[PDB]
Each structure stands twice: as C-alpha cells, then as structure tokens.
Symmetry: D2
Subunit: 385 residues, 4 copies
C-alpha cells in the first residue's frame, strides 16, 4: 500500500501545516515553511499540494515579499516534481470577513472579497491549477434577522458570475468548485450540502464553469450519506474536486485523517470513485490532531494515503468476486440499471402486467438478499473471505 505520485494524492498546505489552535487551545506545533511541507509530502509519495492565498503569502505582504515566497515555493515544486492542481482564497480568517466575503452585509467587504479572489486566481493559473475552490465558511448567520437568504443568494450569484466573467475574459481554463458545509464557523452556512450547491450552480450564468468540492466530514456533519451525495454530484457531471478526511457524525468539524471516522463510508466512497473512473485529485483536507508532534503529522498524512489504497484494493476485490457478482444479481442491482419503461408511456398505461394483473403479494414476498450482499462486502473490507 505504498503511494506514488501516479495515485494523484494531494494535500493542502494548511493540513500538515496546522499548528493546532482550536476553540480552547493554543498552538502545539511551530509553523511549517511551505518548502519543507512540499519536500516532506513528496517523500511520502504525494503528487501535489494546494493552497489558500494566505497560506503561501502572509496576509499584507509587499510585492517583493510576495515574489520571494512564490519563488521559493516554485523551487520546491521543481526540486520534487510536485504539482499544484487546486488553489483557493482565504475569505474567513481575517476579521473583515466576520459576516462573510461574497455575502457580507457590507458591500465594500463583498467587493474586496472579489478582488482578493481574482488576484489569487491569477496566481493559481501561473502555478498550473485546474480547479479553484470556494468555501464560503463565513457566509451565513447565527440569528434570523441578520441575513436575508434570498438577498444573500443574489449576492453569491453575482460574485460567482463575476468570477466566471473574469476567467472567460482572460482565456483561463480553470474551473470553480464550490465547497458546501452545513455549519461552523457560522451557526448555519449558506449552501449547506452538496445538493444546495448543485442547485445553486444551475442558476449561474455559465453553469458549465462550476462544480462541487464535497468534503467527507462536511456532509457527515449533517448526518448525510457522503457516498450518496457524491453519486448525485457524479450523476450531475459536477464532481470537479473532492476533499477526503474523517468525521465521527454530527459534531464539530474534526478533520481526522481519511479512513478514520466512518470506515465503512470510506470503503463505499472509494468503491464509487473507482467504479465511476473519477479522474481528479484525491485531496486530503485534514488536520493531524494537536496531540501530535511533527513525526505524528507525517504519520497521519501517510495514513490518509495508505487507507485510500487499502480500501481501493478491497473494493476492487469485492466487485470482481464472482460470488459478489452473483449476489448483486440476486439483489436485482442489474434490474435497477435497466430502464423502467423504454416501451413508453402509452405502452406502460396499456400493460396489464403493471397494474390489473400485477401480483403484488408475490412481488412483496421476494426477499432482496441485501444482508448476504452486505456481509460479503464486510468480509471483503476486513480481509475475512
């Protein structure tokens, strides 16, 4: 289960670089130089890194400081062969964004958020990114009167439409990926799930430029089934990027390493990504727990990739097992994939087998055989066949 760059594993600078500050806690680790993170991730077999603007260039940097930060980062990428497939904007840390970036009540803040984003889109393209993520973590409210959501969605659409006009104006090939989250740091965040983000994208002027960046733990913060949401995003043609981590159900955003949290959901996720032929980065947005020193940071990052590769092997073995293939037919997964009425509406209306002569009791008596199928899946996951 040794990863290599060909596995397309990527990490945010802010993941392994997390210093361990939490609601209640000061830093437990010193800051990491992005150059060191690139070198250490490459040695573990990562393919690339990703960044927020303010992870790569300290907020408030001069043009000479900005050029030197980017030069040193480019040298680390060149020294390692690491790529930068995705970048994003920090529209959440600075107190100016306390009520939002693109949906701040203050119009001057909304305009600044757009200019900050556009500046970093240019840098992302220079570093070779194909995807630009937007996580509107400050978009939302703690109280009902504070935010008129229809007005906020109008502002959010304006912002994304302006960004689409910008990349079209520059001839850039980059596409956007909107990252849902239901809550935290706002009491409720706008576009709280994959579904809400998919729905929103359909109302943008150029919907083809936008997809989703779903994160395992975010959908699980609403108690939702992450593989099901990924399936809907794939069905819509909108899975442009993905964030992999672990979460234990409905609680604060834990950002555990991938494979931790809901292990069986991780198995079904990998099964789906691999079955569907998802071709994008396998990006980890996780935080090594603050209990860890730097050795533990690199162990946690290595574990992300290891767990993906174990689950990939087990899912592939499940799907290739003739006994599983027989169980899938016994459970009518083949019939689920066949059109209900390719004969057409009139033929269905005229088919007595579909109503007048349908033996509902005989159909009801047919077991689905799902428990045997699921225990084959469990046996494959655990290596107990």
């Amino acid at each position: 289960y040794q990863p290599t760059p060909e596995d397309r594993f990527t990490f945010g600078l802010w993941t392994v670089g997390w210093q361990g500050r939490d609601p209640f806690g000061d830093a437990t680790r010193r800051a990491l130089d992005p150059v060191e993170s690139v070198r250490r991730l490459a040695e573990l077999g990562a393919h690339g890194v990703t960044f927020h603007d303010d992870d790569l260039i300290p907020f408030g940097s001069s043009d000479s400081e900005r050029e030197e930060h980017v030069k040193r980062f480019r040298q680390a990428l060149d020294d390692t062969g690491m790529k930068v497939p995705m970048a994003t904007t920090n529209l959440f840390t600075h107190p100016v964004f306390k009520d939002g970036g693109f949906t701040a009540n203050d119009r001057d803040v909304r305009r600044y958020a757009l200019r900050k984003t556009i500046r970093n889109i240019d840098l992302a393209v220079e570093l070779g990114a194909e995807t630009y993520v937007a996580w509107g973590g400050r978009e939302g409210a703690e109280s009902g009167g504070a935010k008129d959501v229809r007005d906020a969605l109008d502002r959010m659409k304006e912002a994304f439409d302006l960004l689409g006009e910008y990349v079209t104006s520059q001839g850039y090939d980059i596409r956007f990926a909107i990252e849902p989250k239901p809550n935290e740091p706002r009491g409720d965040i706008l576009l709280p799930t994959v579904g809400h983000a998919l729905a929103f994208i359909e109302r943008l002027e150029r919907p083809e430029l936008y997809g989703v960046n779903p994160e395992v733990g975010h959908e699980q913060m609403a108690g939702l089934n992450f593989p099901h949401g990924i399936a809907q995003a794939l069905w819509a043609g909108k899975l442009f990027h993905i964030d992999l981590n672990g979460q234990n159900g409905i609680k604060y955003d834990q950002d555990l390493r991938f494979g931790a949290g809901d292990l069986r959901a991780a198995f079904w996720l990998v099964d789906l990504l691999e079955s569907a032929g998802y071709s994008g980065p396998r990006h980890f947005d996780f935080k090594p727990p603050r209990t860890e020193d730097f050795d533990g940071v690199w162990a946690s990052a290595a574990g992300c990739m290891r767990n993906y590769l174990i689950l990939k092997e087990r899912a592939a073995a499940f799907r290739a097992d003739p006994e599983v293939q027989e169980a899938l037919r016994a459970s009518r997964l083949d019939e689920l994939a066949r059109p209900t009425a390719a004969d057409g509406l009139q033929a269905l209306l005229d088919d007595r087998s579909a109503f007048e002569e349908f033996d509902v009791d005989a159909a009801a008596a047919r077991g689905m055989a799902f428990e045997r199928l699921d225990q084959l899946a469990m046996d494959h996951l655990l290596g107990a066949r």
Copy 2:
C-alpha cells in the same frame, strides 16, 4: 387568533387520522372516517384536506367500493365548503414497496408504482387538486451495495419524466412537488434535503412542472435551518407547497404540531413565508401524539393554526416596528440587498477603493449590531416590547 378558511390552512387525512401505531406500539385510537375528519377540521376553521390514495380508498378496493368512498368524501366537502388542494400516492406502506416505488430494484415494482400514481393523479384532478406531492420514503438503502445511486437517480428521473408526459398528455394544470427527507424509514433516503431535490429537478425534461414540498421536521432531521432552505426554494421559484410541523432536532421524525419543536425557527419561517407573499396552502403534516384521545387530536390540530397566527402577528409587528427598521439599517440589511458590482467587472478591477485603498481594519472594526437586532426579534416574539 381564530382561523378561518381564508387563512388557507390544510391538513392531511392521515394527520388527525393517525391511529398512533409506532415502532414499538399498537394503535391508541380507532380509525376515523374521512367524512368525520372533514367535518371536524371545517369546524376548527380549516380551508381543506389532502390525501394519499390509500387514505381515501382502502388498498385493494373494488370499483363500486371506490366510487362510494369518493361519493361520501365529495358530499362532506360539499357540506363544509372544504377544498382538496393537494394529493399524493402511498408508495411506502405496502410490503411490495419495501425497496422503493420509483427506484425499487425490481423493475415490475417500478412500473406498478407509476401506474398507482397515475391512477391517483386522475382522482386528484377530479377533486380539484393543484399540487401532486411525491414523498419517496422507501427510495434509499440500509447498506452500500444494495442501491447504486446513479442508477437509482436515472430511474427516478424516468419516473418523474413519465409523470410529466402524462399530465401534459391529459392537459392537466396540476404540478408536482417532491418532498425531501434525509432518513426514516430507509437508513438513508434519496434526495435527502431541499437542495438535493432542487438540484434533481433541474435535470428533468420539463423542470417547470416540478417544485419542492419541504417539511419543517425533515430538514431539521439533518440539523439544517428550515427557513434558510425555504429561502433557497423561494429564490429558485420552486416552493410549490409546504408541510408544517415541529421537530426537536436530530432524531426520529416526530411530526409534532406546528409551533412545537423549534419555536424560533417557526417564527422565522412564518416571517419569511409572509414577507415573500407565499400564496400556497399552509399544510400541516403532523401527528397528534398517541397519548391523546380524539379531543386531544382536535386540540392539537387547532394548536397548529393558532401558533401560525400568533407567529404571523409577531413577525409582522417586528418588521413594522420603526426601531426594528432602524436596527436593520444599523446591521446593513439594506446594503445586503444592493448589487455588489452593478458598475461591472472592469470597473470593480479598476476601483482602488476595493483593494489597494480598502481599509480592512476600519471595516473589520465595524460591529454588525446583530445581537441588538435579535433581542428586538425575541422581544417581539414573546410580547415583551
């Protein structure tokens, strides 16, 4: 706070008619004749009722039995002046639907579910319904291998497209409203939230024929903000119907009377419906607790309407209060409603006030004044001004 039919309050037959069977419990009330429910609801000031096919006509009825059930119901509606604005299909109780109706793995069950629906669309139109709800409560899974969600969504789209072809073929004006729910009775249900349903509708052949029927408690079963989801549905033009009830957060579907559960969410919901000018039925999908006798059933139904009317008065008083109007300006709700960049992309890029000369610290220091605004809202809700 006395309701009259002009308030457009509606109830499902299955609400006040719930006999009190639960996971763990036998019935605590005798069955109600739909005629008696129509009479009792009319006396409380309801505007109308709604039905599943199998609430009005027992499953398996002969044509003569069906005609007599409908005749008696029509007489009760005529005697009271009650309307039938919405109807729906039961695709969940009979064991044949144990793996779904429109997304059952068994193709013969999917065809039967469509024929059962189409038969009841014809009856709904005869009784004057404008909306046909679909709650796919059996669509989903308890295990990962049992249901390929992309295939299931293909089947769900086929089904809704065939229903749209049917009502277009008959020249009916009825529209569809898809009701999301995240789980229960399936471990995970497909289209689990308002957002997922809105997203799905955009991929139907005739999206204009379909909207959502969100239910208070269903979105709250995922920990989501129900008023925010309603705002997104209104923003999309898709709030075709609504189900009102109460829920205490993330747990089984409680179906408490409206106003119970999350009271402040109920206040902000009513504020939004009324502000937006929502014109559809205020439908209650609730269950009088099984602790209650029939007197308690009618008290619980009356309480649904009373609570709506109290909250309507308090929300209107909040929005009309000059002190609240001043607080809304202090919190920049006026500025949230103004375009970010009607001057256009190039003007924004050339505006030094938006980046080079934006004083981020001065903007960050400006408080939002949201707590004062929210305490005015609390004082209005409680009648403590």
Copy 3:
C-alpha cells in the same frame, strides 16, 4: 469465524422474529413460532435466546394457553441445548402503557406494570435466567408539562425498589439490568444514557441488585462513544448484560446487525469486552431489515456472530503485537495506568518538580504518538499489517 455455543451469543425472540412493521410500513414477514427460532438459532451456533413476556405468551392468554406456550418452548430448548440467560417485560406495546409503565401518570397503570413484571420474573427464574432487563421505552414525554421528572424518578425508584424487595423475598438470584435509551418512542426517555442509569442505581435501596444493559445503537443515538460508556459501566462494576447491534449516528433506532453501523466502534467495543474479561452473554438486539425474507433473517443473525468473531481476532492480534506494545509505551498508556500521587497530598504539595520546577514547554513539546498507534490499529482491523 464459526460460532459455537461456547461463544455465549444470544438473541431476542423479537429480533429474528421481527415481522418488519415500521412507522410507515406493514409487515414484510410472517410471524415466527418461537420453537422455530430456537431451532434455527441453535443451528447457526447461538448459545441462547431471550424474551419479553408477550413474545413467548400472547398478551391476554388463558392459563392453559400459557402452559402450552411455555411447554413447547421448553421442549425446543431441551431439543437444542439452548439457554435462556435473560428475560424482560413488554411495558411499551399495549396502548395502556402510552404514558409509561412504572412512571405512567396514572397510578393504576403503574401498579399493573409492576404486577406484569413480577409475573414474568417468576417465569424468567423458572427458565433459568440470571438477568432481568428493564427498558422503560415509554417513560418520558413529548412536552414539558406532561411529566415532572423529579416525581417520575421517585416513581421509578419505588418500582425498582419493590422489584428488589420481591426477588429478595423469593430468594431468587436474578439481578436487574436497566437499559438506557435517549428517545424513541417518547420524545425524550428518562434515564437516557448509561451515565443517567448508573447515577439512578446508586439511589436505589439495594444498589447491588441493579446494573445496566447498554445497547450500542442507543448510546450512538445521542452521538456518544459506546466503548467509553461501557468502560464507565465496567469501572462501576455494573455491566450486567449488553445489547449488540449497529447504528449510523444520530437518527431513529436502526437496530442493524452487529458490525454494521460504526465498524471502528465495534472493534474498540470488542477489544474492551475481551480485555476486561466480560463474562456475560453477547446478546444481539437487532432487526433484520424488512427488505429481507427468512433466508436473509438467518444470514443477518449469522453475520452478527461472524463480525464479533472477526473483531475479536483482530483486537487480540493488535494487543499481542510487539510493535503495538512498543507504540502503547511510546504514547504513555503505561503511565496513564500508574497512580498520579501515591506519595500523598503533602508530598505532591512539597514536590517542586510538580510546579515551581516543572518545565511546561518541554512537556508540551512531547508528541503523544497517537496517530501511529491508531494506524497500527487500523492496519490490524483491516488485515493490512
């Protein structure tokens, strides 16, 4: 991973006998004769069964009917070698218990609940049960005024004290195990967690007669860590029985087969039970999904036991691995098990190494090495070492 009776696996009659009725659904399976369940469970390698009074003898049975039901059951136990280690009372299905059994507001119902329990304690002892479970699933409320919880706890203590007086009066060796659950079917249930039940037991007249019967899914319905709660029950000496199943987080009570739901929690549970030398029944309180026919019922029951045995092997291998033993020392699990201050309070107060000369920064810099330890645990669970 083949179970035998020596593994002490037990099942409730109501588990494999569940006919599949849910909030929203009619039965999908015919009723099972308890004799057939005993025979089929024995063939799978179960050690025994458990029962509610009303699972073994239909409610309202005559004395001659009761004797014949018990005779046939005793013959099945004799034919198979199956045991009956635990029994319980149904104080939840009949509508008389709609507001509770022992804490019903109606005093005549509370007295009846006690007489119903006492009658079944006598039968449990005749069939050889060592444990008598009490799940107060109707004890609680949907509204705040309905139930004064201090008064209800006074009634609950009276009831348990009377039951303790009864078994002491008869010279029975049976002990009680209180089963917590946070909600469902009541909006909130009294004694909602392991902790609340443990706390309550300490206020009973004869606390030694009472322990807990925790259920995996019940603690997970409150988002709690089931292994941690089991550890507290073991620390208190009160783990008298356990109910094993699966649950996906905070939602309705799913009662999935054991190993389903939170797989890693199942691993840590088995690790703890086995490490601690828990000697009681490994009882499954689960429901084969209603999608299944009888073949699927027996497959789901077999899977409960298989999954326990797989996890037992992997947990034992984890704890016996020298590399894990080294990682445990690196993470200071040895030091967690050593007294903080066996030198005594005065010695601690006089120890400059504990305050004046404690190098907080050196201590803070020491990583815990928990991620490496947890990835060893993951590798052992998955058979990926």
Copy 4:
C-alpha cells in the same frame, strides 16, 4: 424585565471578554481588562463574576504581577459591590494540557494540573467563592487506543479525591462542581453528560463535596433534554451551579446568549429552577458572537438576563393559572406525584385491581390531555392567553 443584583446573575470574565477567535478566525475584539468587565456588568445589573485562574492572572505571571492583578480586581469588586461566587482552573488552553490535565497520559502533567488547581482554590476562597468548577475539556480522545477509559477514570477519581482532601485539610467550605460536555475540543470527552458525572461522583471518597455544573448547550450537543437532566441533578441533590446559554442542537458548542437556541427548553428550564427553589447563581457561560463590537457584547449580556426574567414571569403565570392547574389535574400530574404502592409489596401482590381485575382497555382509552396542557404553556410563553 430589569435585572438587579438580587436576581443573582453572574458572568465569566471569559464570556464578555471573548475576543472572537474561532477554528477559522482571528480576534475581532481587543482584550478587556477584568476591571472594565466588572464595571460594565455591574452597570447592567449583574450580581457577580467568575474566573479561570488564567483569565485573572496571565499565565506565567511573577508574584508581584499576580498581586497587582488581584489588587486591581478586588478594587473593582469593592467599587461595584460585585461578588465572585465561583472560580475554576484553565486546564485546557496551554499546549501542555493537549492530552488532558487530571487524565493526561503523562504523569508529570497530571501532577502539575493538580498543583495549578490547588493554587487557584486558595485564591478562589480568598475572593469569597462557594463553588469551584472543573471542566475537563481535554480529558478524552480522538482515537480508541490513545486512552484506556477505566485507567483514566481511576486517575480522575484520584485527582478529585486529592482536591477533596486538600479543601478538608484547610477547613474551606468550598464545594466542587463537575461540568460535563460530550465532545469539543476532544473527539469524545470523559464524563460526557450530567448522568455520567453524577455516576462518577458517587464513587469519590467524599461524595458530599461534589456536584454538577451542567451547561444548557453541552447537554444539547448530545441531543438530550436539558430540563430533564437538571431534574435528575436536583433529584440527586447535586445541582451546585449551572451554566446558562443557548445552542441549536447537535453541532459545535455555540455558546449563544441565554434564550437563544432552544427557546422552549429555556422556558421549561426556568420553570424548573424556580419551582424547585434553586438558590445558586444564575451564571451565563456564553460568547457574544464575533460579529459584534463592544456595544454588542453588552447588549448580548443584557439579553441573557432579560430573557431569564421574561421566562420567569411566563412560567410563574403558567403555574398560577387556574385553567393550567385544572389541565394539570386532567393530565394526572397530581397522580404522578403520589406513591405507587405505599400499601407495600404484599398488598400490591394481593390487589386484584392491579392485575386480575384491571380493565386495561378502559385505562388505555383515557386520553392524557397533554396537547391542551402544552398549548396553554405555549400561550403563556408567547403572551397569547
């Protein structure tokens, strides 16, 4: 609804002093001098303040710095008439406590945590505190192997027993209050609920010295009913202190002002505290949202007290209303408060009215009338009678 010091409202220095740092965000407010907080809270009508050691004296202060911080604070208390009824230790912010204080795996950290606590107990007594709170926010784990919970509970008991020996040795009257929380900042926290803490206290050497400090939002983070948990703590005689705030269900710890979050739960809480004659501080452990400037901080603090006083008036009016008193009798709340079997076990066994001649159907048919009672409660809360 104007508070005065006679209402016993208290606030932590860290509440109104919260600078607004969150997972994802830098400070939005400057630090407050404790002297200014004491003055501003007094002007709002607060009775007193509370502190962690490190809120009053910066961590690492010299003895001369410590004396000056305490002198200035004492002068502010003297200038205002404010009291200090409770104090606590910060065993969570400094990185040394990353794996716990009293249950850290490192024994030297456990000894330091005890010395840090003991030093602040002495200061708390000097400032007149009656209660010493312990919130073990770092006690717990993110992974299963990291923490053996039985060993951790042994360490936690040693720590609390040593603290009890210390205050007994000094002749102090102060008592301890253990504050449960289910998670955050640890993935799971030990003693996660009121029940678990109550259970633990019964195993301490001197249980009379220890009670609970429950917090509204903490129990609601597990989806539990906070008034029910308070009722159990009152039933046990262990409600030594309480933390009041608001929370929207199962998510990160929001610390909203009291009355926000679950409004009806706030009503039933106040009803219970007032009915029971709870005599301790009404302490607010809340965070003014980071959206707010200092004017908003003081508005949010004022709102805490206002909301308590509104709910106190409405709860008192509910209980005093003759129509409510009649509804309570109709719902048999009087009968809930009467012993089940003061006639004794033998009399119950010999009472045919309790079994052989109990008419279960007549009892089952009697409605509980809980919905009418709850709508009277709603009408009282909303001022809609």
